[PDB]
Design a binder for these strands. Structure first.
Lengths: 209, 142, 56
RNA sequence: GCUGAAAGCAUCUAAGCACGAAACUUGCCCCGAGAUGAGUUCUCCCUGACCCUUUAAGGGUCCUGAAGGAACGUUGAAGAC
RNA sequence: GAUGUCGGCUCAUCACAUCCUGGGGCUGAAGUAGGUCCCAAGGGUAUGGCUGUUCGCCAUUUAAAGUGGUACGCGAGCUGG
RNA sequence: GUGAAGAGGGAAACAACCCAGACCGCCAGCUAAGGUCCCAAAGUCAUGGUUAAGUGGGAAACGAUGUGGGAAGGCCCAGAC
RNA sequence: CCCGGCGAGGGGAGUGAAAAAGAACCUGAAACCGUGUACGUACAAGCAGUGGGAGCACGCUUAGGCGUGUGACUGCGUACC
C-alpha cells in the first residue's frame, strides 16, 4: 500500500522476556496530511501527495502557501508522493497515521545516507591496498592501473575511481516491524536505516514480501 | 543568370497524413524521406529544407516481408563496456512501434544539421488518431 | 605531463570565462554617521549600527 | 510434444497449437526532461503614462520593482572550492 | 633524431572452444555416482611449501579452483627478484 | 601494364586494380568504367524465368524426400505403389 | 598649476616647424597582448578551407537588385618539408 514519512529519532534496543536484545531504529511518524490527489484523467497516474511536520510561516513562500491552502492543511516541512495500488482511495485533507503499519510485519525504509565527501578508491570501492614497504614509492593507496594498452586506448565508462561518497538516496529492504506505538507516533524497526539522526525517512511495506 | 535558390523564409510547407497500415516498411520509408527532403518539389535546394510535414498513423500496423518480423534485429550501444543491446522487430513493435518507422526514415535522410531539421517534420503515431487537426492535414496515398 | 600542441588564444580565453571578479552588490549605510560600509562590518570611523563601538 | 498433410502410411511443421534454462525483456535498487522530441500537474506574482521613427517580435523617457532570487550574517551528522 | 621486453603487485575488460551452478539427448543410464554430446557467458571461479620464475611438483581446501584475447592487458600506476 | 614522376571518375574508405592522360576559362552538350528505392545524380523501366536461404552480403570434404528444368528406364484398369 | 606618499606616473601650461620629437626620445614593421564597433556562435563532431548560399550590417545608387564585412545551412576536402 502507500507509505509514510517519518524522522530518524535514533537507535536503541528492545529486551524480550526470552532474553534477546533486538537493535531497533526509532522512527517518529507524525500524522501525514494529504495535500493533493492525482488521477489518470488529470495527471495520467494515480498517487497522493502528502506532507508532515510543521514549517515556520515566515519561511513559507507564497506559492507553497497556496498549495497548502487549496487542500486546507497546515504547511509541512516537505512534500512526498506515493503511488496507489489500484485499490486505495484518499481525499485531500485526510490524515494518515502510523496505525496502517499495525499488520505489515516488514517495511522498506528509504533515506539519504551519511555524506562521506570525497572518498578514495580504498574506502569507496574496497580496493586492495598496495604494499606499505618492499620498495613501494608513493603508491600505498593509489588505484593502480586503470586500463589496458593501445588496443582499447581509453578508460571504459563506469570505471571505479575516487569521488563523492554517500549523501545519496539509499533503501534498506525487508526490515522487521518490532513495535507500532500509535499514541506516541513511534515506529520501531529492527536494524539500522540510512541517514543520520533527524533525517527524513520514507517507510513503505516491504515489496519483496 | 544565377540558378534559382530557395529561401528558408519564403518556402511553403504543407501538411499531409499517411496511413501506414499494411504498408511495406522500407518502401513506405523511402517516400516519406523523399517528401521530407522536398525532392518532389521543382524548387528543391540541397541546403534548404523545402519538405512537407507528414503525419504517419497506425505505425504499429506496418508490414515487413519474409521472416523479418522475427529475424530483423535492431542493435544499439549504450556507451558502457557492457554495451550492445538488441531487440527484434516484433519486440520493437510491441514495446514502442513509433521508433520502427522513425529509425527507418532517419537512416534514409541526409546526415547533419539539416537532416535533423527534416526529421523534425515527421510525426508518427501508433494509433489511428492524431491531435494536429488545426494544421488541416491532407490525405496522402503512398 | 606536457602539451603536444600549443593551446590557442581562444582556448585560453574560454578557460578564463570564470575568472571574472564579483563586485559587492551594495553597501550598508549607518544609522547615525550615514557612512557607507560593508554589511555586518564596522565603519571606517568606528560606528556600527549607530553605536560608536570602538574608535579611540 | 499435440493435431496434421505434401507422400491413402509415417511425420513436432509445411497451415495451426502446447511446453521448455542462472542467457534475453520485465520484476528489485539508483540516476534520469540538455528526453533541444527540453514533457506533465498544483500554486504564486505583475492589470502605469508618454515620446520618436527607416512603423516593427522597433527604440527611448518618466513612474513602478511584484512572486521570487541572490547577497551578507550565524551555521550543519553538507562540503576540496 | 627510442614503440621500456620476464615475473609479481594493483586494477581490470572481452571471447566461449563451459571449470562450477542452470536446461537437455544418448548411454555398455537400476539407484547413488559417472561417460559423451547439445544449449547456455547471469554470477562465481583457493590459500600455502620450494624456486626470480610463468609453469610445475607437493600439502591442505572448494560447488568449481575453466581456456584464451587485450603491445605474451596494465613500470608518465608500484616493484626490480 | 601502372605507380614511381599521374591529377580526374569507379572499387564505401584503398600509390600499383578498372575507366581515362589535367594549357586556361564557361551555372553548355555527349559518353567510358561504374550505376539508376533513400542517404546520392539517373528505370520503384519492360518481357520471360529462378531463389525463400536476407542466399544475395565469407569457405571445403561430405551429408539431405529443399526446389526448377531435361533425356531415358522399371512396374501398372490381366488392378501397380 | 593640479592628482599622488614633499613619490612613481600622469593631466594642463609653456618651448618648438613638430612633444603622437619629452630624454624608456628620428623613422616605429612583425610576432604577441588589449579596448571599441559590425556580423556569427551554447543539438553540434574531424587539416578549419573551397564551391554553392540565405540572413544581417554598411556604402552605393537619377529605385538600378552592385561593392564591402560577417557566413546559418550544404557538396567536396586527412598540413608542409
Amino acid at each position: 500500500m502507500i507509505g509514510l514519512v517519518g524522522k530518524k529519532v535514533g537507535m536503541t534496543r528492545i529486551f524480550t522476556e526470552d532474553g534477546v536484545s533486538i537493535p531497533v531504529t526509532v522512527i517518529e511518524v507524525e500524522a501525514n496530511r494529504v495535500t493533493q490527489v492525482k488521477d489518470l484523467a488529470n495527471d495520467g497516474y494515480r498517487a497522493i501527495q502528502v506532507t508532515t511536520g510543521a514549517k515556520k510561516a515566515n519561511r513559507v513562500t507564497k506559492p507553497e502557501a497556496g498549495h497548502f491552502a487549496k487542500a486546507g492543511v497546515e504547511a509541512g516541512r516537505g512534500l512526498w508522493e506515493f503511488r496507489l495500488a489500484e485499490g486505495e482511495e484518499f481525499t485531500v485533507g485526510q490524515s494518515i497515521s502510523v496505525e496502517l503499519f499495525a499488520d505489515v510485519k516488514k517495511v522498506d525504509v528509504t533515506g539519504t545516507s551519511k555524506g562521506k565527501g570525497f572518498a578514495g578508491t580504498v574506502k569507496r570501492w574496497n580496493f586492495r591496498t598496495q604494499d606499505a614497504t618492499h620498495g613501494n614509492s608513493l603508491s600505498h593507496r593509489v588505484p593502480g592501473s586503470i586500463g589496458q594498452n593501445q588496443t582499447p586506448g581509453k578508460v571504459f565508462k563506469g570505471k571505479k575511481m575516487a569521488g563523492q561518497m554517500g549523501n545519496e538516496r539509499v533503501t534498506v529492504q525487508s526490515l522487521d516491524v518490532v513495535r507500532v506505538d500509535a499514541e506516541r507516533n513511534l515506529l520501531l524497526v529492527k536494524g539500522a536505516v540510512p541517514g543520520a539522526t533527524g533525517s527524513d525517512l520514507i517507510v513503505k511495506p516491504a515489496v519483496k514480501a | 543568370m544565377k540558378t534559382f535558390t530557395a529561401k528558408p523564409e519564403t518556402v511553403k510547407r504543407d501538411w499531409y497524413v499517411v496511413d501506414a497500415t499494411g504498408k511495406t516498411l522500407g518502401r513506405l520509408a523511402t517516400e516519406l524521406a523523399r517528401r521530407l527532403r522536398g525532392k518532389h518539389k521543382a524548387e528543391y535546394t540541397p541546403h534548404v529544407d523545402t519538405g512537407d510535414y507528414i503525419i504517419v498513423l497506425n505505425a504499429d500496423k506496418v508490414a515487413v516481408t519474409g521472416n523479418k518480423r522475427t529475424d530483423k534485429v535492431y542493435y544499439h550501444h549504450t556507451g558502457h563496456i557492457g554495451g550492445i543491446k538488441q531487440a527484434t522487430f516484433e519486440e520493437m513493435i510491441a514495446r514502442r512501434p513509433e521508433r520502427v518507422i522513425e529509425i527507418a526514415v532517419k537512416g534514409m535522410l541526409p546526415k547533419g544539421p539539416l537532416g535533423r531539421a527534416m526529421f523534425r517534420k515527421l510525426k508518427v503515431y501508433a494509433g489511428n488518431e492524431h491531435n494536429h487537426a488545426a494544421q488541416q492535414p491532407q490525405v496522402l496515398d503512398i | 605531463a606536457v602539451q603536444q600542441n600549443k593551446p590557442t588564444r581562444s582556448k585560453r580565453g574560454m578557460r578564463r570565462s570564470h575568472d571574472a571578479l564579483t563586485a559587492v552588490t551594495s553597501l550598508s549605510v549607518d544609522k547615525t554617521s550615514g557612512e557607507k560600509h560593508l554589511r555586518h562590518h564596522i565603519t571606517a570611523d568606528g560606528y556600527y549600527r549607530g553605536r560608536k563601538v570602538i574608535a579611540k
